[PDB]
Design a binder for this molecule. Structure first.
Ligand SMILES: CCCCCCCCCCCCC/C=C/[C@H](O)[C@H](N)CO
Lengths: 116, 232, 246, 246, 246
């Protein structure tokens, strides 16, 4: 959270494994894995997405069989800011791998290119 | 009893290398056959397929052997030096080449073979690269599920018995030699020898000719021949 | 007489275990009572000209009890099954029902497009489907049915029905037995897989011998398929999945 | 900072245990994962003139997750609860929310007929209800609303709201705490009782002090009630119960 | 509160050690007092539209104290650093400063000629430089500026600023901390290298979130970068090096 210290609120960060409708609403997002993050207490919340998958290894491409899931954020309680405080604040998100994380079948990245 | 089951073992039943694909690669002028990307699968040929459809699940360390046979086309008196063929792996996600002189042929992380024509066929072993704990020769489901909240039917419309669109990537074969006026048409035959094969949930083999990559069938649905009931 | 009781469901009568493996578990969510009931599918009449029926598991148990609810709410679930096919027949009824449990029972479509059958027609559920004597091709190009065209002697998968006994099978021979029980373990390439999209098993009730009774014109007896999810454990609780069945 | 995690739901912050008893079990059907999620009720705005809100447990958790499904499919189920009432307020917001957990929270009806309130209006569920400053009598004799008429200072049950602290209570005082957690054990005359008809608990969020902020005309902050069924075990699996809510 | 004291310089406040390695030595000339002072760079204002700042180490400490003198007189010197970026902000100021310590912080030039930036513009020193929203190409062919064109989201090196956290980083989030400290060991391909030409590290202070305060039009707060050479040892004493900075 990159808001003011006087800014408080609760953000529901929810991971919903695939196979159902994406969590378009907080009532649907709170059914799957989720964590309430108080912006006042802690400025950063770690939402760990456990390794839940049918296959032992998902593919790195976008494919519906090895799709990972859906990460969403909702306002459990809206942000409450006093006067003389920026009403609109930004936030950052950092993705990371856990110790159990692994990969295989080395390949060439699609990002880089070379015109020839 | 006393006769051994050596030749009948699963390792022995698949010990033979089966042509799974024939890739036509030319060195013609830029007038599309410069390179060719074949989606790696045994379902292009029916023999090894039928041998694998004998079982529902499989786990085998494959062994691919490429036999390249080249010829002179559109020329009675044609010349060209010994060609080198690049057989590059493009696993699901790796950038596929859009042309012969593409950067992806650099193979910085994609495994590739450079086979000199006339040498021994290019053999390479591949471990069990399956996502699941076993290869799924048969899949009784889909990749997507059309939900009630989908905007259209194509969002969840998936092919039956199809797990992933890019199953295991494409094998891109090209002639590393520059495009020569003399057109040399080459056929790379890929032979698949499953090794360390472990099979599960046996299934009866297809008695009707295959039709596509699934279990569908269109014609020739008469496997048995006419024979008397009491005729030996 | 064998009387098998599981959870809150009892069935009175031989039972065969598929592949000699009993359903067993591998934090999954396992309802020890709510999902062990013998859910009874829709009874199907075995007409004299009947060709067979087919159900997909766990697709069949998608609207019965809390098993379907746990299957739709959870992402991926593994579940063994116990299929009891009971066909009440008298001493004068003759016939045989091959009850085959095909792992990954892929069926063939009617259209020329391969693997073009839709999810709604490939997962009929408790209703199930039926086999056909021949392979009727779909001719509606404007609105393709996108449904299976299962053929009895081809088992809907191009294989011969005679070899279908490689699968876990049980023959309900009305002269010696009026019921059959097959205990299927969770068979899948994965230790646990999404059930809403994947059908772990396929039950095929095919009349190997036609049904006759006292030289009557038309004879039809009920067949009741009662499936019990054994050791059904799910994981990935999340919003309910509501597939489109049209 | 306290961060309580149960099943697949985590809540970051003091928590109080009702009657000093922790939810514990007594063949019941206990989903250890599917029913332990912190189901989030509908967020309610704490207006400046707000009088309070009330929910019935487990009535509140009747349509959220598989807990409601197990509650309707099974005959009688016992379930402890963990109610986390979180009210995001700034340093300049003043107010206090009494979060009371009334065992057998009987409310008063609006009509002159005693105990005439209907089942639909007495079990609003996730929506809940609200208290009123005075007791407005129902005057529609042709079509009686048959709904509660909860009064703030009477707690909807004729008792004084000041004495309502005899119940398991927690005060969300926006100056010292923005959230409250109450762990309610299964309180009932019976070891286990039907949940579709009986409401084991009643949560009452009453503003003990009005909400003010920077001398503003109208101020409203969100209040989110997240209830987690702890040690919820059901028994008597049978056909789903579909109550009439109109 | 942490109060770190080194040599004759004390700083009152979390501190992070780069790559988990503390600055340590490998006849080098090591001033244990004259080079351990926390030399304070020029304070920079964090405008509302600011894009970021970048300094090169030890280039930044080339004119401050005897560290610069030992750096110019000696041929090759190795020196760890301790960078304390302090940004005084009130409770109502919002923003985040990513303080990244890029080893071998190569920046991109503005001209079309690759690696054409001059030594004077590539080593600004205590002044440092600033990032730019877009990549403005140098158009002065008669007199090329030969200066970097650092882009915020590209980190001036073509990489994404989001991945810049692979480097030793510290986030000054004005809500939780007003200062950051990064202890960089001597990182270089060589055990010791010429400092007048080589910049062992590069400090990048990039606003990850824009600075806002009470909905004001323009808000700017000071940022002070105080770098302390730790375990700075030089070798090859010889005539002073006087680089051309124009
Ligand atoms: C020159 C480098 C070539 C590297 C070749 C390695 C590619 C690995 C792919 C082999 C996978 C084929 C075996 C799997 C078959 C699948 O089970 C069926 N297509 C159906 O699921």
């Amino acid at each position: 959270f990159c808001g003011s210290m006087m800014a408080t609120g609760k953000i529901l960060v929810a991971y919903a494994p695939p196979g159902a409708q994406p969590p378009t609403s907080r009532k649907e997002a709170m059914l799957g894995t989720h964590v309430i993050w108080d912006l006042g207490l802690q400025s950063s919340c770690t939402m760990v997405v456990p390794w839940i998958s049918n296959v032992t290894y998902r593919q790195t491409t976008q494919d519906s069989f090895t799709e990972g899931g859906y990460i969403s954020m909702f306002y459990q309680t809206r942000i409450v800011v006093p006067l003389s405080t920026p009403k609109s604040m930004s936030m950052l998100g950092f993705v990371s791998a856990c110790n159990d994380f692994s990969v295989r079948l080395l390949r060439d990245t699609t990002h880089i290119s070379q015109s020839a | 009893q006393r006769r051994s089951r050596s030749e009948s073992t699963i390792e022995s039943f698949f010990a033979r290398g089966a042509c799974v694909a024939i890739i036509e690669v030319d060195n013609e002028e830029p007038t599309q056959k410069l390179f060719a990307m074949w989606r790696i699968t045994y379902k292009d040929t029916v023999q090894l397929r039928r041998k694998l459809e004998f079982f529902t699940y499989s786990r085998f360390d494959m062994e691919l052997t490429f036999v390249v046979t080249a010829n002179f086309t559109n020329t009675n008196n044609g010349h060209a030096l010994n060609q080198v063929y690049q057989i590059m792996y493009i696993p699901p996600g790796a950038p596929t080449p859009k042309s012969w002189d593409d950067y992806t042929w650099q193979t910085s992380s994609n495994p590739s073979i450079f086979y000199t024509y006339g040498a021994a066929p290019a053999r390479i072993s591949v471990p069990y690269v399956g996502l699941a704990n076993a290869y799924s020769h048969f899949y009784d489901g889909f990749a997507k599920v059309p939900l009630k909240t989908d905007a259209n039917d194509q969002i969840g419309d998936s092919l039956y018995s199809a797990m992933t669109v890019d199953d295991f990537g494409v094998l891109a074969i090209r002639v590393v030699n520059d495009h020569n006026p003399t057109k040399v048409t080459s056929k790379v035959r890929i032979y698949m020898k499953p090794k360390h094969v472990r099979v599960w949930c046996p299934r009866p083999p297809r008695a009707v000719p295959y039709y596509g990559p699934g279990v569908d069938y269109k014609d020739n649905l008469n496997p048995l021949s006419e024979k008397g009931l009491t005729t030996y | 007489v064998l009387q098998l009781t599981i959870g809150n469901s009892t069935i009175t009568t031989n039972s065969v275990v598929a592949y000699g493996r009993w359903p067993e578990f591998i934090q999954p969510t396992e309802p020890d009572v709510a999902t062990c009931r013998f859910y009874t599918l829709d009874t199907v009449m075995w007409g004299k000209e009947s060709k067979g029926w087919w159900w997909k598991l766990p697709d069949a148990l998608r609207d019965m009890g809390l098993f379907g609810q746990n299957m739709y709410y959870h992402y991926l679930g593994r579940s063994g099954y116990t299929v009891h096919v009971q066909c009440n027949a008298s001493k004068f009824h003759q016939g045989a029902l091959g009850v085959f449990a095909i792992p990954e029972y892929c069926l063939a479509g009617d259209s020329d497009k391969q693997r073009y059958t839709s999810y709604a027609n490939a997962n009929p559920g408790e209703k199930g489907g039926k086999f056909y004597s021949q392979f009727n091709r779909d001719t509606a190009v404007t609105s393709p049915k996108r449904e299976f065209c299962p053929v009895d002697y081809l088992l809907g998968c191009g294989v011969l029905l005679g070899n279908a006994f490689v699968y876990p099978h049980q023959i309900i021979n009305l002269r010696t037995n009026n019921s059959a029980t097959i205990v299927l373990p969770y068979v899948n390439a994965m230790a646990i897989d999404s059930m809403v999209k994947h059908n772990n098993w396929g039950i095929a009730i095919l009349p190997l011998s036609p049904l006759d009774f006292a030289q009557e014109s038309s004879v039809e007896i009920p067949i009741t398929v009662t499936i019990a999810p054994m050791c059904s454990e799910f994981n990935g609780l999340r919003n309910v999945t509501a597939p489109k069945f049209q």
